[PDB]
Protein backbone atom coordinates (compact mmCIF):
# COMPACT_ATOMS: atom_id res chain seq x y z
CA UNK A 1 0.00 0.00 0.00
CA UNK A 2 1.23 3.51 -0.81
CA UNK A 3 -0.10 5.73 1.98
CA UNK A 4 -1.12 9.32 1.52
CA UNK A 5 0.84 11.68 3.82
CA UNK A 6 -2.05 12.50 6.16
CA UNK A 7 -3.35 8.96 6.04
CA UNK A 8 0.04 7.68 7.28
CA UNK A 9 0.22 10.45 9.91
CA UNK A 10 -3.24 9.41 11.16
CA UNK A 11 -2.24 5.71 11.30
CA UNK A 12 1.04 6.42 13.10
CA UNK A 13 -0.72 8.56 15.72
CA UNK A 14 -3.33 5.74 16.29
CA UNK A 15 -0.36 3.35 16.89
CA UNK A 16 1.32 5.74 19.30
CA UNK A 17 4.27 7.33 17.46
CA UNK A 18 3.13 10.84 18.25
CA UNK A 19 5.88 12.09 20.64
CA UNK A 20 7.31 8.59 21.08
CA UNK A 21 10.68 8.81 22.82
CA UNK A 22 10.90 12.58 22.37
CA UNK A 23 10.04 12.57 18.63
CA UNK A 24 6.91 14.47 17.51
CA UNK A 25 4.81 12.74 14.81
CA UNK A 26 6.22 14.66 11.83
CA UNK A 27 9.59 13.07 12.49
CA UNK A 28 8.16 9.65 11.72
CA UNK A 29 6.18 10.68 8.67
CA UNK A 30 9.31 12.42 7.31
CA UNK A 31 11.51 9.33 7.98
CA UNK A 32 8.96 7.16 6.10
CA UNK A 33 8.90 9.60 3.18
CA UNK A 34 12.68 9.39 2.66
CA UNK A 35 12.90 5.66 3.38
CA UNK A 36 9.99 4.28 1.30
CA UNK A 37 8.07 7.18 -0.20
CA UNK A 38 5.20 5.84 1.99
CA UNK A 39 5.12 2.47 0.18
CA UNK A 40 4.64 -0.42 2.68
CA UNK A 41 5.95 -2.83 0.00
CA UNK A 42 9.31 -1.13 -0.42
CA UNK A 43 12.34 -3.47 -0.04
CA UNK A 44 16.04 -3.05 -0.83
CA UNK A 45 18.68 -5.73 -1.08
CA UNK A 46 22.08 -5.13 0.57
CA UNK A 47 25.51 -6.55 -0.25
CA UNK A 48 25.54 -8.74 2.86
CA UNK A 49 22.38 -10.57 1.70
CA UNK A 50 20.12 -8.77 4.20
CA UNK A 51 17.07 -6.79 3.03
CA UNK A 52 15.45 -3.52 4.26
CA UNK A 53 11.66 -3.72 4.56
CA UNK A 54 8.67 -1.48 4.70
CA UNK A 55 7.78 2.13 5.21
CA UNK A 56 10.76 2.60 7.49
CA UNK A 57 13.13 0.16 5.70
CA UNK A 58 13.89 -2.01 8.69
CA UNK A 59 16.95 -4.31 8.15
CA UNK A 60 16.85 -8.13 8.32
CA UNK A 61 20.37 -8.64 9.63
CA UNK A 62 19.26 -7.18 12.99
CA UNK A 63 15.54 -6.59 13.30
CA UNK A 64 13.43 -9.25 11.67
CA UNK A 65 13.68 -12.73 10.27
CA UNK A 66 13.41 -13.57 6.56
CA UNK A 67 15.53 -16.76 6.76
CA UNK A 68 17.98 -15.60 4.11
CA UNK A 69 20.96 -14.89 6.37
CA UNK A 70 21.22 -17.81 8.83
CA UNK A 71 22.50 -16.71 12.21
CA UNK A 72 21.25 -13.10 11.92
CA UNK A 73 19.25 -11.42 14.66
CA UNK A 74 15.48 -10.88 14.79
CA UNK A 75 15.38 -8.20 17.53
CA UNK A 76 11.73 -7.25 16.81
CA UNK A 77 10.81 -10.96 16.81
CA UNK A 78 8.76 -10.84 13.62
CA UNK A 79 8.94 -12.28 10.05
CA UNK A 80 10.21 -9.45 7.82
CA UNK A 81 7.15 -9.90 5.64
CA UNK A 82 4.94 -8.45 8.41
CA UNK A 83 6.81 -5.17 7.65
CA UNK A 84 5.38 -5.07 4.10
CA UNK A 85 1.73 -5.28 5.30
CA UNK A 86 -0.86 -2.57 4.46
CA UNK A 87 -1.40 -2.58 8.28
CA UNK A 88 1.59 -0.68 9.72
CA UNK A 89 1.37 -2.19 13.22
CA UNK A 90 4.43 -4.42 12.85
CA UNK A 91 6.55 -1.55 11.38
CA UNK A 92 5.45 0.78 14.15
CA UNK A 93 6.14 -1.69 16.98
CA UNK A 94 9.53 -2.55 15.56
CA UNK A 95 10.39 1.16 15.03
CA UNK A 96 9.54 1.73 18.74
CA UNK A 97 11.99 -1.07 19.64
CA UNK A 98 14.64 0.46 17.38
CA UNK A 99 14.37 3.84 19.11
CA UNK A 100 15.11 2.66 22.70
CA UNK A 101 18.06 3.16 25.10
CA UNK A 102 20.75 5.27 23.40
CA UNK A 103 19.52 4.47 19.91
CA UNK A 104 17.60 7.62 18.74
CA UNK A 105 16.08 8.28 15.27
CA UNK A 106 19.73 8.65 14.12
CA UNK A 107 19.38 4.91 13.52
CA UNK A 108 17.70 6.12 10.30
CA UNK A 109 20.39 7.98 8.35
CA UNK A 110 17.82 9.51 5.95
CA UNK A 111 15.98 10.94 8.97
CA UNK A 112 19.22 12.40 10.27
CA UNK A 113 20.04 13.92 6.87
CA UNK A 114 16.64 14.98 5.55
CA UNK A 115 14.38 15.51 8.62
CA UNK A 116 16.37 16.18 11.75
CA UNK A 117 16.24 19.86 12.64
CA UNK A 118 13.71 20.72 9.94
CA UNK A 119 10.22 21.97 10.57
CA UNK A 120 8.91 18.41 10.93
CA UNK A 121 5.42 19.56 12.02
CA UNK A 122 4.84 20.55 8.36
CA UNK A 123 4.43 16.80 7.60
CA UNK A 124 1.29 16.69 9.63
CA UNK A 125 0.01 20.12 8.65
CA UNK A 126 -3.50 20.07 7.23
CA UNK A 127 -4.11 16.56 8.42
CA UNK A 128 -7.20 15.54 10.28
CA UNK A 129 -5.37 14.19 13.35
Amino acid sequence: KVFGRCELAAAMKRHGLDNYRGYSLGNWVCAAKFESNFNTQATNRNTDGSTDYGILQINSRWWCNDGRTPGSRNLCNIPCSALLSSDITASVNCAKKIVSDGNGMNAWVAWRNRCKGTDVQAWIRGCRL
Epitope: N46, T47, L56, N59, W62, S72, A95, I98, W108, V109
Partner: nanobody, 133 residues
Framework: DVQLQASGGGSVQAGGSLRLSCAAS????????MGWFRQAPGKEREGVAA????????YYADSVKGRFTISQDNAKNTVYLLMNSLEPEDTAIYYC??????????????????????????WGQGTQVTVSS
Protein backbone atom coordinates in the same frame (compact mmCIF):
# COMPACT_ATOMS: atom_id res chain seq x y z
CA ASP B 1 30.46 1.89 29.10
CA VAL B 2 32.24 0.99 25.85
CA GLN B 3 35.90 0.01 25.92
CA LEU B 4 38.07 -1.06 23.00
CA GLN B 5 41.36 -2.89 23.77
CA ALA B 6 43.86 -3.64 21.03
CA SER B 7 47.08 -5.58 20.89
CA GLY B 8 49.63 -6.62 18.28
CA GLY B 9 51.58 -4.15 16.21
CA GLY B 10 55.13 -3.25 17.15
CA SER B 11 58.05 -2.66 14.79
CA VAL B 12 58.91 -4.54 11.62
CA GLN B 13 61.09 -4.25 8.51
CA ALA B 14 59.54 -3.03 5.26
CA GLY B 15 58.04 -6.01 3.40
CA GLY B 16 57.11 -7.61 6.72
CA SER B 17 53.69 -8.21 8.30
CA LEU B 18 51.92 -7.50 11.59
CA ARG B 19 48.50 -8.56 12.84
CA LEU B 20 46.43 -6.24 14.99
CA SER B 21 43.47 -7.38 17.08
CA CYS B 22 40.83 -5.48 19.01
CA ALA B 23 38.23 -6.55 21.58
CA ALA B 24 35.18 -4.53 22.50
CA SER B 25 33.85 -4.81 26.00
CA UNK B 26 30.76 -3.23 27.54
CA UNK B 27 28.20 -3.96 24.74
CA UNK B 28 25.14 -6.16 24.96
CA UNK B 29 24.18 -5.72 21.30
CA UNK B 30 26.52 -4.43 18.63
CA UNK B 31 28.76 -2.74 17.81
CA UNK B 32 27.39 -2.25 14.33
CA UNK B 33 30.77 -1.38 12.88
CA MET B 34 34.38 -1.93 13.91
CA GLY B 35 37.34 -0.46 12.09
CA TRP B 36 40.88 0.68 12.04
CA PHE B 37 42.13 4.27 11.60
CA ARG B 38 45.73 5.50 11.94
CA GLN B 39 47.63 8.75 12.54
CA ALA B 40 51.21 9.25 11.40
CA PRO B 41 53.41 11.85 13.18
CA GLY B 42 52.00 15.37 12.89
CA LYS B 43 49.26 14.26 10.48
CA GLU B 44 45.45 14.13 10.56
CA ARG B 45 43.96 10.75 11.60
CA GLU B 46 42.80 8.82 8.47
CA GLY B 47 40.74 5.67 7.84
CA VAL B 48 42.34 2.31 7.14
CA ALA B 49 39.70 -0.43 7.09
CA ALA B 50 36.18 -1.12 8.39
CA UNK B 51 33.75 -4.02 8.54
CA UNK B 52 30.02 -4.43 9.20
CA UNK B 53 29.71 -6.74 12.19
CA UNK B 54 26.40 -7.65 10.65
CA UNK B 55 27.35 -9.30 7.40
CA UNK B 56 31.12 -9.02 7.37
CA UNK B 57 31.26 -6.71 4.31
CA UNK B 58 34.70 -4.99 4.35
CA TYR B 59 35.89 -1.52 3.29
CA TYR B 60 39.48 -0.34 2.67
CA ALA B 61 41.21 2.99 2.14
CA ASP B 62 42.90 3.02 -1.29
CA SER B 63 46.29 3.25 0.45
CA VAL B 64 46.12 -0.25 1.88
CA LYS B 65 43.97 -2.18 -0.64
CA GLY B 66 45.42 -5.54 -1.50
CA ARG B 67 47.86 -5.48 1.42
CA PHE B 68 45.62 -5.32 4.51
CA THR B 69 42.75 -7.61 5.38
CA ILE B 70 40.23 -6.80 8.07
CA SER B 71 38.16 -9.65 9.62
CA GLN B 72 35.75 -10.11 12.56
CA ASP B 73 34.47 -12.67 15.02
CA ASN B 74 30.95 -11.33 15.66
CA ALA B 75 30.12 -13.59 18.64
CA LYS B 76 33.31 -12.50 20.45
CA ASN B 77 33.07 -8.80 19.42
CA THR B 78 36.59 -8.80 18.13
CA VAL B 79 38.09 -7.40 14.96
CA TYR B 80 41.48 -8.16 13.32
CA LEU B 81 43.70 -6.33 10.84
CA LEU B 82 46.23 -8.49 8.94
CA MET B 83 48.89 -6.17 7.53
CA ASN B 84 51.12 -7.59 4.78
CA SER B 85 53.78 -5.89 2.68
CA LEU B 86 54.30 -3.09 5.18
CA GLU B 87 56.18 0.03 4.13
CA PRO B 88 57.78 2.93 6.05
CA GLU B 89 54.75 4.99 5.01
CA ASP B 90 52.48 2.72 7.14
CA THR B 91 54.25 3.81 10.36
CA ALA B 92 51.67 5.39 12.65
CA ILE B 93 49.58 5.06 15.81
CA TYR B 94 46.72 2.66 14.84
CA TYR B 95 43.31 3.01 16.46
CA CYS B 96 40.58 0.41 16.88
CA UNK B 97 37.13 2.05 16.48
CA UNK B 98 33.45 1.08 16.73
CA UNK B 99 30.06 2.56 15.78
CA UNK B 100 27.55 1.61 18.52
CA UNK B 101 24.42 2.73 16.70
CA UNK B 102 22.26 -0.22 15.64
CA UNK B 103 21.01 1.30 12.41
CA UNK B 104 17.41 0.64 11.31
CA UNK B 105 18.09 0.39 7.64
CA UNK B 106 21.31 -0.99 6.16
CA UNK B 107 24.42 1.14 6.89
CA UNK B 108 27.81 0.80 5.15
CA UNK B 109 30.55 0.86 7.72
CA UNK B 110 33.06 2.21 5.21
CA UNK B 111 31.26 5.59 5.29
CA UNK B 112 33.18 6.75 8.38
CA UNK B 113 36.56 5.79 6.92
CA UNK B 114 36.77 8.93 4.74
CA UNK B 115 34.49 11.32 6.63
CA UNK B 116 36.91 11.74 9.55
CA UNK B 117 35.49 8.80 11.50
CA UNK B 118 31.88 10.13 11.47
CA UNK B 119 29.64 7.70 13.40
CA UNK B 120 32.53 5.95 15.14
CA UNK B 121 31.75 6.90 18.70
CA UNK B 122 34.23 4.58 20.48
CA TRP B 123 38.00 4.52 20.19
CA GLY B 124 40.95 2.54 21.46
CA GLN B 125 43.91 4.33 23.12
CA GLY B 126 46.08 3.71 20.07
CA THR B 127 48.70 1.10 19.14
CA GLN B 128 52.11 1.97 17.65
CA VAL B 129 53.21 0.40 14.41
CA THR B 130 56.71 1.23 13.09
CA VAL B 131 58.04 -0.02 9.80
CA SER B 132 61.79 0.21 9.19
CA SER B 133 63.16 1.52 5.91
Amino acid sequence: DVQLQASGGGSVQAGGSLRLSCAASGYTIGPYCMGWFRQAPGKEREGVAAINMGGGITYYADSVKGRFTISQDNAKNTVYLLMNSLEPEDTAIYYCAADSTIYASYYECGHGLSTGGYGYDSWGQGTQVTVSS
